[PDB]
RNA sequence: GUGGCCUAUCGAUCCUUUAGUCCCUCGGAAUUUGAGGCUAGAGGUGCCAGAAAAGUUACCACAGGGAUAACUGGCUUGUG
RNA sequence: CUAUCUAGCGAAACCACAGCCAAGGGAACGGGCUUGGCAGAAUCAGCGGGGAAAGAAGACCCUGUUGAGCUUGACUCUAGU
RNA sequence: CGUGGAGGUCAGUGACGAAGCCUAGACCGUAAGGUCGGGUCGAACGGCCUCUAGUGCAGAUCUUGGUGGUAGUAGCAAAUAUUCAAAUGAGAACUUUGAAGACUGAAGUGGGGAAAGGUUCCACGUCAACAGCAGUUGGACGUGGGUUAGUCGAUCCUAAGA
RNA sequence: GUCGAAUUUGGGUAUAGGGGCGAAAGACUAAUCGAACCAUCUAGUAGCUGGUUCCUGCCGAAGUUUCCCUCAGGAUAGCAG
RNA sequence: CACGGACCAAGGAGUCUAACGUCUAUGCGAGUGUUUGGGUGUAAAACCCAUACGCGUAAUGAAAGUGAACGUAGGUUGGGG
RNA sequence: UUGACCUCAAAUCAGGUAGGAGUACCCGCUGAACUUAAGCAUAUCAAUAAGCGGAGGAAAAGAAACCAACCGGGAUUGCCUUAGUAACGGCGAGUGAAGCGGCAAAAGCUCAAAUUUGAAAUCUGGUACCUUCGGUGCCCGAGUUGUAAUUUGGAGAGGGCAACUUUGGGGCCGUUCCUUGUCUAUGUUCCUUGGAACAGGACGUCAUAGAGGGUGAGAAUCCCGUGUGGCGAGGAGUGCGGUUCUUUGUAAAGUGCCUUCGAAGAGUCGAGUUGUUUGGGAAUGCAGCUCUAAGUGGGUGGUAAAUUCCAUCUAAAGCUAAAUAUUGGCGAGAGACCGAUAGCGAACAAGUACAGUGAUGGAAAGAUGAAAAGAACUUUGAAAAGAGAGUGAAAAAGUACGU
């Protein structure tokens, strides 16, 4: 059962696995179904763009916080700063998320600009029903794409103050490690 | 009390780990048993909720709330005619009431990873082999 | 059913095969050896006018193909129709024939 | 070539539909082409066969023989001509079953519905 | 002079426990208990490269074995 | 009364191929191999020497990290009390 | 080397006979095999370059089906027993009638029933198969006919029990 | 052997599988009993027995070492392509 | 004188899948992988594509952690060309 | 005496409703062993089979008492990945998630807890009429032990001040979708073989139709269809493209500022213990028993505890499309699948014949010919049949029938 110089393998097939095998024979069929469903939904919703406008947010975690992506919806504060109510925003094609909060001025200002540009690029048909026939744009994300914010200029002058970056990192670790013991010794005295 | 295993003379005919008879517990609460028996008694009604009232050493007492799906005061009421949908027949039997969902472990968070979306449904997803046309 | 049916091929190597096939179409000896009747065609590759793309009728399309030297290849396809030689006949594969020109 | 998803090229399905076709559908299947004289007069190509039609045989060993249809044997996918028969050894006579696609209609039986069918097909 | 003049006198993983280092971790941030790691020993497997283990079947069962006993035959002839 | 012969009716077991011996050697007891004895169509009724005859993957014995029935302060549990 | 199927090609073979089968007829290959002639037969099939697999049998007390030797052999011997003539029929040890000889010997081989069977009951027609010989006969085969209740039973009652 | 009784027997009814029933043989419970029959889990596991399908060409062994509840089996080194 | 085989026809046994070792062929190469999905289509084919993700490009410690040039990226011996 | 109320009954009272079937997929309960560990008891097989209860076209889940520790993300479900990883495990055999990241699909919400109190403003039923999936009038009844309006934490409410912005409910005609009918090309022209031309040869035609099937042998052009279009018939759904009848309304909704407030779910959270379960390890979820809270509170922050901070949500009440599943049902399209010992057990009067007391078990069996033209008549025989004759392209096809 164990022979030769081979890696240790862990193949989890000791249950009735053959009863739960899923082969995606309908991969091509489902692609046709999704394309048909998108086409019939676009014809149903008039010239509406088939998707709602989304804000730009910072991804969490230290690993992914260097990038911005699309969030669920604009906050109540962002909607209010744009000059309209949340209820009217939902009926006009804007996603609203009540549980997200604003703590960064850069993110808040950018989402305010997105709402203002969106309002100036759409036409809202009156409730009377005359309904002038306008061409349908199938995507709002492509019309309003998300770009990573600029960080630094291409070239700049060298400014060295004589300090050491390695020394700065080492001292930062040391201060955090011994903060508790230093306070106790100071308090006991 | 507990649920004594209904085996003849205590014989289980198996391995020692399954030999227990006396100290076994029913996976559903006594409140769930109360609703189910009331549901069978009045099968023309729908179980909405129930609550504790009393208890002694032998019994626990409950009161069950029932709604008539045929009455016109219910069918014409917007806030309650959802119960008239056939998808809501015998909610207590499938554990769709408040006490049923607690026993099913239907809650959010890392503490309910086994039962968040349904224990058997989650187990099927995690024990399924997925193969594509162009094998990964 | 979970036998492997489709096969992955590297995208770049796939394009390598396509480019080789295109270059092979310009070699008269290779085209003749594949069974095509291009013996008396003046030049290979054969390039025709762009107005061929606007032909609407089968009758005029066939006449245009014959006028550039593809008449013999068309007759090869018509005279090569045969009944299949096995159980594939009643599996919706009843007739076989040669391949003609690609436009 | 086939271009519709509602039609099938399956040999098994087509043959089963042919041999289990009901009586009404077999009438359309048993169509015969008109003669050049009638084709010019009416302007149509072919019609379903009817009992009181005069026909000419253009294929088989009975080619050249005329007559009037005596029976349309839909169950057997065949028609019978009154003067096209066969003599047995005992002296009796039996009709010979013929397929309408091997016949040519020389005279039509006209009624209100037959005339409407000709007009519906673009005839005059 | 790194135990007994020389040639025998003895013991893995898991767990427990002790010594050492007072070092590393308890993952939102700290102090103190507690717990968990790092290095070196001890508690033992004598079937001694180390499963935790009483009988009976003359009511009996199965897979096998002429690799193997209860008859002849063959070799041997102590014994007769 | 059978067996026996005739008219009618008509199976099964079994079958590697088959069917005369002596010795030899050989898986240490041959129908076949070696050396000799010999050996002539087709057959009927009997017969139990042989075919280590047929009927069953030995019930005895041993092996297997194969069981079951039963017993007991074997190991580990349990209804009841 | 050979087999089922797939892409390409030989504008391959074929109702003027494709495939299959038979053939102590011929040729090629060390061999796996390939090719030809003759007969039979009736509708599809092959060479080459490549792809693919449910791809090659003498055995498994192998599976299913078919067939032998044994062999015209074992055998068709319990329950005392049959015989003569006529009739019928292509045909009679076995059917029908008559005559004779016998048996069951009233706890019967007699005369009725309960369960169980289900038309086996009766008549006419009729013998391929069945009646381990025979058959003109039959509980066989074909076609029809037949079971009549206020009083006989069920139905009602209760038993162990359900 | 027994033959007027602890007799024989019909029908109705009760007891169902670790259960029943037993004037007690491990007997009987539909030709099945030291734990019935039917379907499924189940293509249960087997270090053990049997079988394992075309040709030609070249090379060509081992029954030994160490460890194993190891002694009809494996790992390991060797021999081979 | 060990076992299977009375006879014939047809059927009849190393397969597929997930994850891997060695070797070989192919594409590209400090990179590589279009096919989850989107676009497109003569429609389960073919053709086209963004962002991520996998592996590789750094190791070593239980961990906190730290992290690869004294030099023609060293000296010596043997080395095809 | 008489009349209420409360509670509990009766009726072949008036009107309704539940059961059974199917069960592929879905929501729960209950629950093994063979097997693996080369023995075996924990473990594994498996939170599986069998057993029981309950739904739909999907079900379930779902608008955070979440994830996080970041410059934070933001209902649920599914795919790619995380990852055979953290972790569990006689730490043996084995087992094994989750956050982030890309993508498919996207949708939000409402009760309880407040005095309408200058007017229960609410609703079932009966009855008459009417524009009948309902409406109006009138009369009983339900209900204050609380039926409407108003407010669900994102808030929001009671007062005061100043402002503008926006309509609702039906007909008809078309469109969108489904179920259907009808119409819409081109040779059967000559020669040879043959029983049969649909074969071979010559000469033509159509093609947005050379898919497929039929017809006496391989048929684009003989027939049905195929391709491209036109013309009808009957419904569903108000999704919407035009027209038309009703003013709904001293009605409703949104927005600024000041002030006072801001009710938020109990034998429940939580704790101990026992059992079961999980990757969850001083204990992941679930259940029994015992104990049993708080309101700047409460839950969580993956090592038990005391003390001090921080972060993050708001439990113990409720509804909700799509992306997902589907060996069942109904309607379709396909295959490098099988070709009558194969393929479903069944290509056939197949779950049939037959067996068993019963639960159950369960076969074999396809091919005359283009057309019966299925052999008149003669002769031998009691008959079955034989020998001739005859039919057919062929009786070397005779209903014991292709080869
Ligand atoms: Cl052909
Ligand atoms: Cl004699
Ligand atoms: Cl050869
Ligand atoms: Cl029973
Ligand atoms: Cl380190
Ligand atoms: Cl624990
Ligand atoms: Cl079927
Ligand atoms: Cl049975
Ligand atoms: Mg590539
Ligand atoms: Mg063939
Ligand atoms: Mg000394
Ligand atoms: Mg922590
Ligand atoms: Mg040892
Ligand atoms: Mg031991
Ligand atoms: Mg021996
Ligand atoms: Mg002596
Ligand atoms: Mg001898
Ligand atoms: Mg001897
Ligand atoms: Mg012998
Ligand atoms: Mg001899
Ligand atoms: Mg001799
Ligand atoms: Mg004898
Ligand atoms: Mg003898
Ligand atoms: Mg044996
Ligand atoms: Mg035995
Ligand atoms: Mg052993
Ligand atoms: Mg045992
Ligand atoms: Mg031939
Ligand atoms: Mg021969
Ligand atoms: Mg034929
Ligand atoms: Mg095979
Ligand atoms: Mg064979
Ligand atoms: Mg062999
Ligand atoms: Mg055999
Ligand atoms: Mg005899
Ligand atoms: Mg005899
Ligand atoms: Mg006898
Ligand atoms: Mg006698
Ligand atoms: Mg007597
Ligand atoms: Mg007498
Ligand atoms: Mg009679
Ligand atoms: Mg007889
Ligand atoms: Mg006879
Ligand atoms: Mg009869
Ligand atoms: Mg008795
Ligand atoms: Mg005994
Ligand atoms: Mg097997
Ligand atoms: Mg078995
Ligand atoms: Mg050699
Ligand atoms: Mg052996
Ligand atoms: Mg043997
Ligand atoms: Mg034998
Ligand atoms: Mg074979
Ligand atoms: Mg085979
Ligand atoms: Mg393989
Ligand atoms: Mg009533
Ligand atoms: Mg479930
Ligand atoms: Mg084991
Ligand atoms: Mg084993
Ligand atoms: Mg065992
Ligand atoms: Mg089940
Ligand atoms: Mg339904
Ligand atoms: Mg759906
Ligand atoms: Mg639902
Ligand atoms: Mg909320
Ligand atoms: Mg989320
Ligand atoms: Mg598990
Ligand atoms: Mg359980
Ligand atoms: Mg642990
Ligand atoms: Mg812990
Ligand atoms: Mg719900
Ligand atoms: Mg079959
Ligand atoms: Mg025929
Ligand atoms: Mg013939």
Q: Please state whether strand J lies within 7 Å of residue B51 at its CB atom.
A: yes
Contacts of B133 in chain C (CB under 8 A): 5-6
Give chain C positions within 8 Å (CB) of B134. 6-8
Domain D1-124 has CATH 2.30.30.30: yes
Q: What are phi and psi of D48, to 5 degrees?
A: -60, 145
Residue C54 contacts D where some CB pair is shorter than 8 Å: no
DSSP, collapsed to helix, strand or coil, labels residue B122 as: helix
Rounded Cα gap, residues B43 and B33, in angstroms:
15
Q: Give the start-to-end residue ranges of the domains of chain D.
A: 1-124
Q: What is the 8-class DSSP label of residue C95?
A: E
Distance, angstroms, CA A8 to C1' H10? 78
Cβ contact A144:A114 at 8 Å: yes
> Would strands D66-73 and C95-96 be described as parallel, antiparallel, or unpaired?
unpaired
Residues written for chain C: 103
Adjacent-strand bridge partners of D67: D55
Query: Which of B124, B131, B132 shows the shortest C-beta gap to A21?
Result: B131
- Counting CB pairs under 8 A, whether chains A and B reach 3 or more, is yes
Interface partners of chain B (CB pairs < 8 Å, 3 or more) are: A, C
CA distance A30 to chain C (A): 17
Distance CA D5, CA D124 (A): 36
Domain boundaries, chain B: 1-136
**Inter-chain touch D9–C92, beta carbons under 8 Å:** yes
Using a 10 angstrom Cβ sphere, with 0-12 exposed, 13-18 middle and 19 or more buried, the burial of residue B92 is: buried
**Residues facing residue D71 across a β-bridge:** D80
Q: Nucleotide J268: nearest residue by CA–C1'?
A: B52
Q: Which of A57, A53, A61 is nearest to A70 (CA)?
A: A57
Q: Which nucleotide is nearest to B8 (CA to C1')?
A: F79
Six-digit token pair at D118? 């000709």
Question: Domain B1-136: which topology?
Answer: Ribosomal protein L15e (3.40.1120)
Compute, in angstroms, the gap from residue A29 CA to the centroid of ligand 52. 61
Burial of A145 (0-12, 13-18, 19+ CB in 10 A): exposed
- The closest of D104, D118, D95, D102 to D53, measured between CA atoms, is D104
The enclosing H or E element of D82 equals: strand D78-87
CA of residue A15 to C1' of nucleotide J46, angstroms = 8
DSSP 8-state code for residue C30: H
Nucleotide closest to residue C58 (CA–C1'):
J207
């Amino acid at each position: 059962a164990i022979s030769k110089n081979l890696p240790i393998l862990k193949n989890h097939f000791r249950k009735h696995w053959q009863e739960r095998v899923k082969v995606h024979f309908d991969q091509a069929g489902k692609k046709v179904s999704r394309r048909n469903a998108r086409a019939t939904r676009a014809a149903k919703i008039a010239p509406r763009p088939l998707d709602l406008l989304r804000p730009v947010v910072r991804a969490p975690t230290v690993k992914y916080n260097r990038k911005v992506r699309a969030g669920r919806g604009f906050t109540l504060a962002e909607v209010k700063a744009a000059g309209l109510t949340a209820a009217y925003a939902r009926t006009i094609g804007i996603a609203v998320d009540h549980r997200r909060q604003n703590r960064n001025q850069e993110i808040f200002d950018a989402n305010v600009q997105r709402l203002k540009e969106y309002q100036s690029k759409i036409i809202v048909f009156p409730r009377n029903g005359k309904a002038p026939e306008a061409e349908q744009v199938l995507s709002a994300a492509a019309t309003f794409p998300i770009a990573q914010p600029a960080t630094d200029v291409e070239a700049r002058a060298v400014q060295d103050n004589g300090e050491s970056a390695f020394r700065t990192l080492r001292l930062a670790r040391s201060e955090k490690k011994f903060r508790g013991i230093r306070e106790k010794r100071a308090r006991e005295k | 009390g507990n649920r004594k295993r209904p085996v003849p003379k205590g014989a289980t005919y198996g391995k020692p780990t399954n030999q227990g008879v006396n100290e076994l517990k029913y996976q559903r609460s006594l409140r769930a048993t109360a609703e189910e028996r009331v549901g069978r008694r009045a099968a023309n009604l729908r179980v909405l909720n129930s609550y504790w009232v009393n208890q002694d050493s032998t019994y626990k007492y409950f009161e069950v709330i029932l709604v008539d799906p045929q009455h016109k005061a219910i069918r014409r009421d917007a806030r309650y005619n959802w119960i008239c949908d056939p998808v809501h027949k015998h909610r207590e039997a499938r554990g769709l009431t408040a006490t049923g969902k607690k026993s099913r472990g239907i809650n959010k968070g890392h503490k309910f990873n086994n039962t968040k979306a349904g224990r058997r449904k989650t187990w099927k997803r995690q024990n399924t082999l997925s193969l594509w046309r162009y094998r990964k | 059913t979970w036998r492997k049916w489709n096969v992955k091929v590297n995208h770049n190597e796939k394009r390598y095969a396509t480019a080789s096939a295109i270059a092979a179409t310009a070699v008269a000896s290779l085209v003749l050896a594949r069974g095509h009747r291009v013996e008396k065609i003046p030049e290979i590759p054969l390039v025709v006018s762009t107005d061929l793309e606007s032909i609407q009728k089968t009758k005029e399309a066939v006449a245009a193909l014959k006028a550039v030297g593809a008449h013999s290849d068309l007759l090869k396809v018509l005279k090569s129709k045969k009944l299949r030689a096995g159980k594939g006949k009643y599996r919706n594969r009843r007739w076989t024939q040669r391949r003609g020109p690609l436009v | 070539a086939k271009q519709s998803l509602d039609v099938s090229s399956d040999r098994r399905k087509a043959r089963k539909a042919y041999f289990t076709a009901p009586s009404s559908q077999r009438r359309v299947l048993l169509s015969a082409p008109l003669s050049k004289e009638l084709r010019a007069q009416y302007g149509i190509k072919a019609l379903p066969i009817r009992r009181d039609d005069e026909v000419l045989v253009v294929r088989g060993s009975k080619k050249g023989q005329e007559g009037k249809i005596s029976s349309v044997y839909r169950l057997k996918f065949a028609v019978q001509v009154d003067k096209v028969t066969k003599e047995k050894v005992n002296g009796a006579s039996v009709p010979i079953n013929l397929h309408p696609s091997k016949l040519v209609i020389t005279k039509l039986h006209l009624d209100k519905d037959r005339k409407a069918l000709i007009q519906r097909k673009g005839g005059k």
